[PDB]
Write an enzyme that holds these catalytic residues in place. Structure first.
Site, PDB file in Angstrom:
ATOM      1  CG  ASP A 134     -80.851 -68.941 -10.158  1.00 51.10           C
ATOM      2  OD1 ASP A 134     -80.543 -68.285  -9.127  1.00 51.10           O
ATOM      3  OD2 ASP A 134     -80.300 -70.039 -10.468  1.00 51.10           O
TER       4      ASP A 134
ATOM      5  CG  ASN B  88     -79.338 -62.481  -4.034  1.00 55.04           C
ATOM      6  OD1 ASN B  88     -78.867 -62.348  -2.915  1.00 55.04           O
ATOM      7  ND2 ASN B  88     -79.441 -63.666  -4.631  1.00 55.04           N
TER       8      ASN B  88
ATOM      9  CE1 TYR C 100     -68.992 -62.431  -2.371  1.00 53.51           C
ATOM     10  CE2 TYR C 100     -68.527 -60.903  -0.590  1.00 53.51           C
ATOM     11  CZ  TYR C 100     -69.407 -61.749  -1.236  1.00 53.51           C
ATOM     12  OH  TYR C 100     -70.669 -61.894  -0.737  1.00 53.51           O
TER      13      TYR C 100
ATOM     14  CE  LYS D 112     -71.206 -59.098  -2.836  1.00 47.32           C
ATOM     15  NZ  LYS D 112     -72.237 -59.287  -3.897  1.00 47.32           N
TER      16      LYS D 112
ATOM     17  CB  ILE E 234     -76.026 -65.718   4.950  1.00 39.41           C
ATOM     18  CG1 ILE E 234     -76.010 -64.187   5.023  1.00 39.41           C
ATOM     19  CG2 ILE E 234     -77.447 -66.287   5.110  1.00 39.41           C
ATOM     20  CD1 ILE E 234     -76.328 -63.621   6.384  1.00 39.41           C
TER      21      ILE E 234
ATOM     22  CB  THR F 159     -76.718 -69.826   1.392  1.00 35.80           C
ATOM     23  OG1 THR F 159     -75.349 -69.684   0.988  1.00 35.80           O
ATOM     24  CG2 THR F 159     -77.330 -68.480   1.718  1.00 35.80           C
TER      25      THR F 159
END
Lengths: 250, 250
Positions: free
Chosen positions: A38, A90, A156, A160, A189, A191
């Site tokens: 991270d 990720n 994006y 992707k 999602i 998050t």
């Protein structure tokens, strides 16, 4: 319900929060030695702390996936824990919210650099490593937006979309070395990142565009990644795997 | 026979040879004013020469599609000939022939830069321009390798995959301005370049992978682009259109 994934190390890029965090914990609980990568050291460490506390094995590595040197370092780090057999790429980021026409060049290059190039950079020593020590599984966090588009999030979806090709091709070339490569495709999602920027009214809207009438939870994405990363999924390579409450079935 | 495509100008990036050249001539013959863009002035001009000679209107512009300034220049150039509808983003390049692992960083960044970013850079003033003067059609030269992969041409397929998302998304946001955006998907096309650089045994292989048992000719790709770029294709936006002798049906 545990996943085969034991005796291995796993790199979970962008593993400090949200999906990556869920993925880190899920793999960790099924015996996997997880290298939690991270940008934020405090976040990466908090997860490692959670894993260790729940019986698991894990180490943190704070840096930037955009830097190829950081990719080899994550490999050698994880590899120190146990033979590298899993890799969940990720780490991603949303770009500027604007049309293809109005889109800044910086933002576009940035989103691509993180969401696509970083994956590639990371994948390189991942592939050589798993290919050396008998096989493994790379899981690339694509999205619903790897197969459909979404107004104002050009960069994006483009990035992707690019993962799917990178995934496919890596899967072909290193299949014979028993290194699988797959792409997961989450829908929207909930998050804390998505929740923090984006309104109550906004999220209501996106909910309605999923058949289940809600957004996915991080663990729901983590389950499919855990499975695909395991020996249980040993004839699945090259493929794209949706988890989107029937977003793309429309 | 002819395609509606008259009254207007068309940008045909990488129009100096092969498919781009075929696309240039085909549009030109059906009344279109074509701006033939290429890295070579000698090639771009030879085509302009051919168009003019066969009754048409055309101008050349030699440069680098990597440079966003070159995109606005192509727009203003074409736009000088006739109002801009039609833009065929054809310019691409093959990268290094190697595995994802062994792939040089330069080559990878280069092919992405040409095969993906250049399109985006070019698309920006294309979109604003067509949106101003009533509508139009952008056609992005993807490939079969935008939906399947091909061993050792990682970067190529990744970039060609990215076009499909860029295409989709541009189509969504400028649909209401009647600017269509589509992606063509050729299979292996028998261009004079391809024949030289590839063996007898090699060509046998590629031919055998197409259902029709041969490679496509440039004009075969040019027909579908011409059609899609025309008013005849006025309910086609956002879609990907294969012309591959049933390569992907297998």
């Amino acid at each position: 319900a545990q996943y085969d994934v034991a005796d291995r190390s796993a790199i979970v890029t962008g593993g400090g929060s949200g999906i990556g965090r869920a993925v880190a914990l899920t793999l960790a609980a099924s015996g996997a030695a997880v290298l939690v990568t991270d940008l934020n050291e405090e976040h990466a460490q908090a997860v490692v702390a959670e894993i260790e506390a729940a019986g698991g094995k894990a180490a943190a590595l704070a840096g930037d996936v955009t830097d190829p040197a950081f990719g080899e370092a994550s490999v050698a780090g994880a590899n120190a824990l146990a033979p590298l057999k899993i890799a969940v790429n990720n780490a991603g980021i949303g770009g500027e919210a604007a049309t293809v026409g109005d889109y800044s060049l910086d933002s576009w290059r940035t989103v691509i650099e993180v969401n696509l190039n970083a994956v590639f950079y990371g994948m390189q020593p991942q592939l050589k490593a798993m290919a050396a020590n008998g096989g493994g599984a790379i899981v690339n966090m694509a999205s619903i937006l790897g197969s459909v588009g979404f107004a104002n999030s050009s960069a994006y979806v483009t990035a992707k979309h690019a993962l799917l090709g990178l995934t496919q091709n890596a899967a072909l070339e290193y299949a014979a070395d028993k290194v699988r490569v797959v792409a997961v495709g989450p829908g929207f999602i909930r998050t804390p990142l998505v929740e923090a920027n984006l309104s109550a009214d906004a999220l209501a809207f996106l909910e309605g565009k999923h058949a289940l009438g809600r957004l996915g939870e991080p663990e729901e994405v983590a389950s499919l990644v855990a499975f695909l990363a395991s020996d249980a999924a040993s004839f699945i390579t090259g493929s794209y795997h949706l988890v989107d409450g029937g977003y793309t079935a429309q």
